[PDB]
Amino acid sequence: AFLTVERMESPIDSADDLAKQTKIEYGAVEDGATMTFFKKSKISTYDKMWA
Amino acid sequence: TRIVGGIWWFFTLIIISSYTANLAAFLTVERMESPIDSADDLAKQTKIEYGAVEDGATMTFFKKSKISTYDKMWAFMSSRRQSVLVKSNEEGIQRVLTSDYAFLMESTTIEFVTQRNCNLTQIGGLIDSKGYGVGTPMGSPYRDKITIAILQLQEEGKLHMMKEKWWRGNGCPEEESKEASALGVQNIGGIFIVLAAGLVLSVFVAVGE
Amino acid sequence: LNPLSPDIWMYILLAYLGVSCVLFVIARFALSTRIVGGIWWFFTLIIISSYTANLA
Amino acid sequence: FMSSRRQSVLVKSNEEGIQRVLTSDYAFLMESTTIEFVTQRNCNLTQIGG
Amino acid sequence: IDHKADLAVAPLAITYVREKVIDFSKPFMTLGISILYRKPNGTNPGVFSF
Ligand SMILES: *[C@@H]1O[C@H](CO)[C@@H](O)[C@H](O)[C@H]1NC(C)=O
Ligand SMILES: *[C@@H]1O[C@H](CO)[C@@H](O)[C@H](O)[C@H]1NC(C)=O
Numbered sequence A: 001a002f003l004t005v006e007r008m009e010s011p012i013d014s015a016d017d018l019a020k021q022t023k024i025e026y027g028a029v030e031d032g033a034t035m036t037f038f039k040k041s042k043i044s045t046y047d048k049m050w051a
Numbered sequence B: 001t002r003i004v005g006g007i008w009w010f011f012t013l014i015i016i017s018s019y020t021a022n023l024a025a026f027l028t029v030e031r032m033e034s035p036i037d038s039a040d041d042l043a044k045q046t047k048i049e050y051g052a053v054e055d056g057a058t059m060t061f062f063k064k065s066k067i068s069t070y071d072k073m074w075a076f077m078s079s080r081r082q083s084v085l086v087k088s089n090e091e092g093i094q095r096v097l098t099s100d101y102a103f104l105m106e107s108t109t110i111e112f113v114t115q116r117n118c119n120l121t122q123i124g125g126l127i128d129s130k131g132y133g134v135g136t137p138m139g140s141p142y143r144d145k146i147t148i149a150i151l152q153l154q155e156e157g158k159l160h161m162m163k164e165k166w167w168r169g170n171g172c173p174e175e176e177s178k179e180a181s182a183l184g185v186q187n188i189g190g191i192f193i194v195l196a197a198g199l200v201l202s203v204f205v206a207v208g209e
Numbered sequence C: 001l002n003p004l005s006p007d008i009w010m011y012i013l014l015a016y017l018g019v020s021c022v023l024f025v026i027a028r029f030a031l032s033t034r035i036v037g038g039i040w041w042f043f044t045l046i047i048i049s050s051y052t053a054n055l056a
Numbered sequence D: 001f002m003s004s005r006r007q008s009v010l011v012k013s014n015e016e017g018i019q020r021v022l023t024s025d026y027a028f029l030m031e032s033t034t035i036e037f038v039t040q041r042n043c044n045l046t047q048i049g050g
Numbered sequence E: 001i002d003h004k005a006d007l008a009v010a011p012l013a014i015t016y017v018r019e020k021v022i023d024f025s026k027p028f029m030t031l032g033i034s035i036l037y038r039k040p041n042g043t044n045p046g047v048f049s050f
């Protein structure tokens, strides 16, 4: 179980892998052209990022 | 000699426990990930390249598509026309061959290409509503004649052979379609080889003395 | 039996029969027996490990 | 989506929709009361939605 | 546009706008757009898979 927990998460966590996971915290300037493209322009993983 | 026997017992138990745990972890992580992409669904990925040709028939169909399984794809490929969008069908096929890319034309073209080269795969099909037939600019009767001739052509058996001989090409090698979770022959043969080598060396050193 | 293919089952059966036959030959004909027992134990360890992993 | 795929799985009635469900990976969309009525009458079916 | 050729034999995906401008005949073939991808590549760990 420990090994599956540590391996199901993506160690390289490239782009879309960050959307599904929630353990790692992430963010940027609030509405500083970062999530302005994410509130609109619905893209699946980008929509998860906006959410 | 009870303490050493017990500690050896626990040693073997914990080592085999770690071996089983790590191997099981590898199997679960590889099986949980779908070996193929989601059937006719490139969504929720946004990492593997996907799209079609620029301003093709598929582009026309999915540009005016508001379904979330398709509108997000359309928006992304319109935003990234410089990278994920190609000009010609063969260009997209080559892009798929060189690197991970998803390409979207008529099923007949895809199957023709995969018969001409077994390096690219096909997953879904008939995700678009269309039909192929002869054309007639006006409301003529000869189009009706052609349609009734075609319909009487399907009712008799000739279409299958002529249809397939066009797409036959080279013989398609037999490849699995319903593989199960059982381990492969090469996946288990290593322990057989190791056991056989150990046994033959043991027999040789026993008969030598 | 999902973790093992029928051919894998045949391989396991032939390995078991070979181990039994070589043990009988050794009996009819201790370090060599110790090595044989150890390698057979390890064989069981890896095969059960693969079985557990796949069905898990 | 259904407009984009009209009459593709649009059954004429439940008396063919149930067989369409039982013959493939087909999901039905009907009023509730009939749905649990069918599930009680015919097994292998449950109202997945609430 | 000049109606030079009364017929055009080719794979003609009969879209709604195309049907509006050219009243096409009944589709000889029923087909649809399909997905393309690279064949899976097996990087096996060899006979010593363990
Ligand atoms: C796939 O491509 C490789 C080189 O990229 C080539 O060696 C191989 O023959 C190709 N496979 C088929 C089935 O054409
Ligand atoms: C489950 O039922 C569906 C619909 O009849 C069928 O296609 C599928 O093969 C069945 N699977 C199993 C494991 O019974």
Ligand SMILES: *[C@@H]1O[C@H](CO)[C@@H](O)[C@H](O)[C@H]1NC(C)=O
Pocket (backbone or CB within 6 Å): E038, E039, E040, E041, E042, E043
């Ligand atoms: C193709 O094979 C390469 C091996 O270099 C591998 O890295 C890649 O993931 C494979 N791609 C597919 C789609 O199987």
